[PDB]
Q: What sequence folds into this?
């Protein structure tokens, strides 16, 4: 049992909660997690989390994993895949039941290339969704099954209020990432995207293949794989969009009125 | 090219536009049909429309089909399936290109039983979605691909503002349609539901099988197949919900403030 929905009360009066192609934009107050938890537990949903920790960024893993244990997908099956050039530096963090961690030794194109190769491996047969995040981050509040859908991106925290001409899309037509000044729905950040395994195979292959074309042509998109992620999600629109609750920098941007929760935040 | 979404402007301030399980509730101003038309034309989407016209209700077919030609899924592939006990009384309405009509001779349980049998037939191999509507209705405004999703129901026009204890669910526990007083999200009407062919196979089989159980037990649910449709959509929640724009009675209920468009309306 849970509260009845209120047809004549808006979930939010201050923000857009559904895109013009009818994908939910996920903010606090738009979902009842008790309903979603039951839906996804009935399918025994398993979520894979990829994170890269190369060179000095191995230092971020301890807090990243400790705080993921408190706030990411708790109660669901989770498998962490840590891609790193220093496997001995992976901290031994104690995980809750139903949660596992694998270390994948590596191994600008690297993240799309490596997630593409990995996403095609038969050892993911049991994993239903992949979530791909930056490591220099911590979880401060719930990040759960409300994000899961065939394909999602996350609104970049510096640009959610910006008009599209101000978005830092790739603007040179000789790049595979090019987006004209009069096109674009949102500016998505490269630091949190995901979807079903099949949709993440598709996105990461397309971005990697596009990056290889630009390399052959002697061009590097302005924001590297984030430029390619934005061209891809313009042409293949996501089935949910995460609000900046899911990707925030409090030191830079504070705690604005429209953020009811700060869920996953940058570490200085 | 089309208008950029406005992250900091709500699509509506007067109505709920997403359910608590993140299914869009489809109202005017929540979608840009130009974006959705392109998505669904890229898949060469074909929509099957079932309607029953038995006994005196054959009289409603002429306006139903004429107005469907003006307003339902125009530009997409459509196949009408008219279930009737009087095939000669089916009016010969001229259809737009890419649109076809078949007459299926029949043939309280009938609609769920007949849509179930029909939805399993291999001659639907090309049809992607089924939309199942009442015939004593006319289209007055756009009904298009914004409704298409794996499973949808429509908010009943007499009950969208009601609390759940006032919903006319089946309340006897000896019926397969039973819903307790403290359960229920919405009251859906039996006059407009649909989804992919697979989800409509599932819904109509479950409702028909439940109706056969109640018959064996000497019970008939209070509102017949609408009671069973509501029990099914409580346990298998729809992936979009249509607002009462899609199922309205202007003579009964006027043109209230929250209705920007009256799309599919009852005939007296
Ligand atoms: O438009 C809404 C309003 C609420 N909720 C969620 O449904 C649950 C209960 O909502 P309610 O506002 O009734 O909160 P309560 O006052 O009972 O604590 C919470 O998880 C809300 O975030 C939602 O998904 N959509
Ligand atoms: O030397 C590096 C640089 C980057 N990264 C990984 O790449 C992600 C994105 O890089 P960064 O945070 O510097 O860019 P943004 O902006 O996102 C980081 O979160 C790490 O997961 C890494 O592991 N080692
Ligand atoms: O929150 C919104 C606002 C608008 N639209 C749709 O996007 C298109 C353009 O919206 P706009 O309000 O900019 O209308 P305009 O003033 O350009 O006629 C129309 O189909 C709107 O219904 C939408 O899907 N969600
Ligand atoms: O004698 C009848 C009674 C009902 N119907 C069909 O069943 C639908 C639902 O019946 P009705 O409109 O009487 O109930 P509601 O309420 O929906 C009608 O729209 C018709 O499509 C029919 O064809 N002949
Ligand atoms: O430092 C440059 C990087 O900035 C972000 O982390 C962005 O998501 C990456 O694609 C890359 O452009
Ligand atoms: O007249 C009774 C009928 O009323 C509505 O049309 C309802 O959707 C049907 O299931 C049936 O109960
Ligand atoms: Mn980062
Ligand atoms: Mn009717």
A:
């Amino acid at each position: 049992v849970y509260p009845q929905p209120k047809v004549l009360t808006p979930s939010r009066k201050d923000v857009l909660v559904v895109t013009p192609w009818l994908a939910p934009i996920v903010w606090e107050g738009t979902f009842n997690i008790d309903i979603l938890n039951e839906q996804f537990r009935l399918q025994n949903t398993t979520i894979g989390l990829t994170v890269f920790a190369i060179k000095k960024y191995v230092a971020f893993l301890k807090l990243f994993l400790e705080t993921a244990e408190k706030h990411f997908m708790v109660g669901h099956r989770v498998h962490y895949y840590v891609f790193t050039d220093q496997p001995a530096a992976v901290p031994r963090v104690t995980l809750g039941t139903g949660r596992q961690l694998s270390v994948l030794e590596v191994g600008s194109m690297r993240r799309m290339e490596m997630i593409s190769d990995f996403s095609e491996r038969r050892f993911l047969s049991e994993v239903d969704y992949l979530v791909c995040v930056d490591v220099d981050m911590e979880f401060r509040d719930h990040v759960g099954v409300e994000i899961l859908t065939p394909l999602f991106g996350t609104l970049h925290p510096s640009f959610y209020g910006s008009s599209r001409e101000a978005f830092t899309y790739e603007r040179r037509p000789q790049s595979q990432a090019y987006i004209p000044k009069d096109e674009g729905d949102f500016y998505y950040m490269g630091a949190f995207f995901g979807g079903s395994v099949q949709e993440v195979q598709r996105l990461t292959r397309a971005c990697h293949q596009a990056m290889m074309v630009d390399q052959a042509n002697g061009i590097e998109a302005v924001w590297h794989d984030e430029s390619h992620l934005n061209k891809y999600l313009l042409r293949h629109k996501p089935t949910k969009v995460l609000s900046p609750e899911y990707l925030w920098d409090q030191q830079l941007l504070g705690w604005p009125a429209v953020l009811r929760k700060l869920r996953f935040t940058a570490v200085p």
Q: What stands out?
A: The first strand of chain B starts at residue 25 and ends at 26. Chain B has one domain: 1-268.
